[PDB]
């Protein structure tokens, strides 16, 4: 099976994929990613990233209970938080144009737009239509080409 | 610097502190640290560290179900794990001289020798005297004066 470092490297490439199907009403010069909560696979992200057009993705960790997350970032990578913490996070994001992605595949029921599944041979993901719809960003539907091909041996 | 980044530095400093009160049966030239499980505050550790005595601490992430954790490291820094994952981890550690520190720990009853509480204005930690007693590493008792 795949090692942690292998998976971490893949997670950032999947994230770059997802980002390509997403549009922010006010596109920043630098995309800001916040990592929130304990994570296993964010060490790659946290080195910062570059998109194909050369836009930099700056990444940093932030407290679960920071009330300004909606304002402080364009993207959130959500780690393994509890019911009360998760509610805090998605309350803070409501109203703002933020893309949310969870490290684990259980947060798609509770507010995350995309949920990663890092086990198995490839990284796959699922998405939630309700959360996408209320998000404030636009997500091209082809984003699922990425998930489907990822789930194909 | 975010609060998470400042606490991660503080976590680094607390671990180095704890390390100075710990001795290994056969002392390695390089101290291996494994970060296992989801963590918020290990980014400082993962950049690597050096002990006051000059010894380098090599850190890396390893998987919860890595069966060789006991032989792969001297210190394990343990993140969020469920019951099964915790039991799994400690089975791999059984019979090996491994220092164990968990990032959370509202109980510190079962598992790690030390449990951080990174909350509040300062990092505090608790000791599990049972886990310490049967660990293979020598923990100097002064370290309990640094616990809460």
Angle, nearest 10°, between helix axes A143-150 and A4-20? 150
Contacts of B32 (CB under 8 A, 6+ apart): B57, B58, B72, B73, B74, B75
Of A132, A32, A34, A120, which Cα lies nearest the Cα of A76? Answer: A34
Resolution expressed in Å:
2.6
Say how far apart CA B54 and CA B56 lie, in whole Å.
6
Method: X-ray
Beta-sheet pairing, A49-50 with A56-62: antiparallel
**How distant is the Cα of A117 from the closest Cα of chain B, in angstroms?**
14
Measured CA to CA, the distance from residue B60 to residue B32 in angstroms comes to: 8
- Determine whether the interchain pair B37/A40 forms a contact, defined as Cβ–Cβ distance below 8 Å: yes
Q: Name the interface residues of B facing A (CB cutoff 8 Å).
A: 2-5, 8, 37-40, 43, 46, 60-63, 79-80, 103
Round to whole Å and give the CA distance between A12 and A7: 9
């Amino acid at each position: 099976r795949t090692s942690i470092e292998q998976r971490s490297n893949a997670v950032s490439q999947v994230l770059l994929g997802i980002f390509s199907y997403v549009r922010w009403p006010k596109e920043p010069a630098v995309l800001q990613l916040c990592v929130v909560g304990p994570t296993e696979y964010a060490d790659g992200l946290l080195r910062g990233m570059v998109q194909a057009n050369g836009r930099r993705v700056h990444a940093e960790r932030r407290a679960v209970d920071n009330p300004d997350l909606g304002t402080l970032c364009n993207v959130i990578y959500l780690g393994v938080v509890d019911e009360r913490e998760r509610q805090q996070v998605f309350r803070s994001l409501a109203g703002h144009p933020v893309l949310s992605i969870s490290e684990r595949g259980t947060e798609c029921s509770v507010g995350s737009m995309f949920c990663l599944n890092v086990g198995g041979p490839r990284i796959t993901f699922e998405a939630n239509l309700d959360s996408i719809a209320r998000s404030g960003v636009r997500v091209h539907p082809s984003v699922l080409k990425l998930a489907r091909r990822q789930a194909t041996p």
